[PDB]
Design a protein around this ligand. Structure first.
Ligand code: FAD
Ligand code: FAD
Lengths: 461, 461
């Protein structure tokens, strides 16, 4: 039984970040990883997604070429070219992460970890035992798929993982789900030329975002050529002579349900949720608490219910983002190895960018959330809607919408929501301002940068 | 003699902003404008410049098309197409500004104003007299050109004004100056296909910016195909059979001076400075103080040396930006018509974006300035340099450099300097944070947005 100061199960964002900081602090750490280092973000998430987004962005910009004084650009996007380049780049990152671990003197234990029956918390990987007084579970999650029992033929569809395996651009694609991943995938496939449908159970996407954003985002998708199938769900999927045939039920409220067949589908992409990876951990041997989806339950300090066992990142099921897993993993290392007992991540005011077209940036409370927290009488919002100057000379148009949610007399900024060209890079510093507790006067007292989109947020009235 | 509450001379950024706010406050105002409303920013500055920048940005992005999986885009940029569209857009803005004035009930007096000999400050426009207890001079500036006495043939060159009159893309262009305008023009002309040279008196451009930025900016220009002629200046210009011939002296220190002829020049663009527009105002009839360049001298509240006479914007020669003129003009209206005596613009921490390729964003003190303000022992900087993820798959490359200047033990953020893709939209919120007095912990405690360039500023170590 090899003993370490810190054993981290999972070599993705949270697990690596935590292991690296711990090692800086003098800890003797080891990371168990059964697949590729970098985990979801590098292999099948953040990185490959962004590359595909940059590609889709090229496609749109190329539509404006002639408007800008150039000759029309004519053609066909070649999926395999970019796919090969994207894979290579992921390969480069995996090699860097491995090197980062080595330079830090962190041991990499390759294989699938599981807890043992042993009294003092101990794991087994490939027959060998490993123990530490602090063990971090950072095993992440996976895409959720429907059971054949509920939706026959569901296994004919792919997930976001399968999306990163595709080698040709699917001619006809149907995406099921209304969350950010669904939105992102629909936007990429459509911009690159796939005849794309997005099938959502209600009338808008991103229903948990501020309502200005869910409305605007739904319209932008339609305007970009994505067919949004509202109040619809899949009833069955079948393999026809040439592709898939999707049977769906559309049930608009105030109307009779109607069943429709969608034929000749090349790609059926389930983007319905993520499930935690805890199933094969043998958690029950230690009696570690999970919720009914399999998420590990933790407190504000990432503690599980068992002493010396922690969990961070996707596996915990809250704020499923690369930077949160990293920040939580880091704060945890400072708490354990630097003896900073108050060291923990604040889960409020975490900013998010959704890589739609145009991108979305959000931080803090939606208007409804502020209304429930402070009361209608105490909430004031400011908003603007305009066409960015980039489109002054284009036939194709996109809008920029921004909304500021203020609370109390002081007009504290408690929420910022926007969608528009450049909003992906614009959000970070306002997130800093929001975290510091800025009020509207603080924004108003900052001299604008002209001509930009960003200047609209400091000149709202 | 028609009397008003407020008479504003100049209908550009500062003059309009001040007049509009004053009118909201109940003032009976009139704006004197001898040319087009909107003044420099709309007609020959900010707006038309940005449109030309967006165009140049299209040209660069089109170089990456094939790398992104598309077929090579082949050609020739058509200057007149975009020029016509740009003019139209400026026409649209002029009509809006005029309407804004009318809706506000501000009187527009068309013509050239000059002060009179009269005791109580009074102006004359087209034979008629006008007076007010508060008169704002906001007459802006103009491009500076060399005297034929010092540089013979200088009048064969054009200025940034003339740039906006061009109808064809000049084949060979030489830009003289090393400030932001020179840099911007060089970058646009070059990206659009002009064989461009930038002639600077020293070895770097933007010598007043933080030294990381002047160095990086000079390299980016060279990398983009702009020939930077260092330690050079124009000695004479002459009209040859086919274009202009520029005689220049290059005097590298530690070397003998060398004279060179630059032949076949289509466009010689002077971007050497701006001069205030005060010459024809008859300021001396009121004894209003100017410096030796013709700038009107004012105090912290925009007061001139004469009671009831103020000046804002370019004419004052400090912080020559559209938003500063606006903010100063607004604060002034609140002071005069809302009786807010402490109402004035803080000229510290004004953010600037330079529309180079990639763009530059700066706010606060350069490293040297912080060193002079706090002492070397009290200044700590953090910086990063990386290749944005956008170029992971391109043969063409650009860099992103960021620098954070902190002061004292607390590591107050006193300067942010960066150059890179997306830095034009990234700066605004960090400018808010800097204005609020953020420290490095405030940045560090803000969760990053992945994957973006902006996230680098919150993860500096
Ligand atoms: C398509 C997609 C796009 C996304 N886009 C973004 C985005 O743009 N921005 C953003 O912030 N977030 C994004 N996310 C979310 C972000 O990628 C995740 O929140 C983050 O990767 C979670 O990190 P983690 O450390 O919890 O787990 P992960 O990186 O999944 O790492 C878990 C690791 O544990 C390994 N493992 C699991 N069980 C075991 C075991 N028993 N033994 C050994 N090893 C094990 C797994 O192989 C894996 O390598 C995206 C996610 C997806 C799916
Ligand atoms: C090429 C270029 C690019 C620029 N790019 C940017 C940028 O991207 N961002 C930015 O922030 N700034 C930029 N600037 C600077 C910005 O445009 C100026 O700081 C701003 O326009 C100054 O406004 P102002 O109100 O002082 O004067 P102006 O807008 O020049 O207005 C002065 C007005 O007074 C009128 N006038 C003058 N004398 C008289 C008189 N006697 N009687 C009646 N009317 C009179 C003039 O016709 C004019 O309309 C740029 C400038 C230039 C030249």
């Amino acid at each position: 039984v090899a003993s370490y100061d810190y054993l981290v199960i999972g070599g993705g964002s949270g697990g690596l970040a935590s292991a690296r900081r711990a090692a800086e602090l003098g800890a003797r750490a080891a990371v168990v990883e059964s697949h590729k280092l970098g985990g979801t973000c590098v292999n099948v998430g953040c990185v490959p997604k962004k590359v595909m987004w940059n590609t889709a962005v090229h496609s749109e910009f190329m539509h404006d070429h002639a408007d800008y004084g150039f000759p029309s650009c004519e053609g066909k996007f070649n999926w395999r070219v970019i796919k090969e380049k994207r894979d290579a780049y992921v390969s480069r990152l995996n090699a860097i992460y491995q090197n980062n671990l080595t330079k830090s003197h962190i041991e990499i234990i390759r294989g699938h970890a599981a807890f043992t029956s042993d009294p003092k918390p101990t794991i087994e990987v490939s027959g060998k035992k490993y123990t530490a007084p602090h063990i971090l579970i950072a095993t992440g999650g996976m895409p959720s798929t429907p059971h054949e029992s509920q939706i026959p033929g569901a296994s004919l569809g792919i997930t976001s993982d399968g999306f990163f395996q595709l080698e040709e651009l699917p001619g006809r694609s149907v995406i099921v789900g209304a969350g950010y991943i669904a939105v992102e995938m629909a936007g990429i496939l459509s911009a690159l030329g796939s005849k794309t449908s997005l099938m959502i159970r209600h009338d808008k996407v991103l229903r948990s975002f501020d309502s200005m954003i869910s409305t605007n985002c739904t319209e932008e998708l339609e305007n970009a050529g994505v067919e949004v199938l509202k109040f619809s769900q899949v009833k069955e999927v079948k393999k026809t002579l040439s592709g898939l045939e999707v049977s769906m039920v559309t049930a608009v409220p105030g109307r009779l349900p109607v069943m429709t067949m969608i034929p000749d589908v090349d790609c059926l992409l389930w983007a319905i949720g993520r499930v935690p990876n805890t199933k094969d951990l043998s958690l029950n041997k230690l009696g570690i608490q999970t919720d009914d989806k399999g998420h590990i339950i933790v407190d504000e300090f990432q503690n599980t219910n068992v002493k010396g066992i922690y969990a961070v990142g996707d596996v915990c099921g809250k704020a499923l983002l690369t930077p949160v897993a990293i920040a939580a993993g880091r704060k945890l290392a400072h708490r354990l190895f630097e003896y900073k007992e108050d060291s923990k991540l604040d889960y409020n005011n975490i900013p998010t960018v959704v890589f739609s077209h145009p991108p979305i940036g959000t931080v803090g409370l939606t208007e409804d959330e502020a209304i429930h927290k402070y009361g209608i009488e105490n909430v004031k919002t400011y908003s603007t809607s305009f066409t960015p100057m980039y489109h002054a000379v284009t036939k194709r148009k996109t809008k920029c919408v921004m909304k500021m949610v203020c609370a109390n007399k002081e007009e504290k900024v408690v929420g910022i929501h926007m969608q528009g060209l450049g909003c992906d890079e614009m959000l970070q510093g306002f997130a800093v301002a929001v975290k510091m507790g800025a009020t509207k006067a603080d924004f108003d007292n900052t001299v604008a940068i002209h001509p930009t989109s960003s200047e609209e947020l400091v000149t709202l009235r």
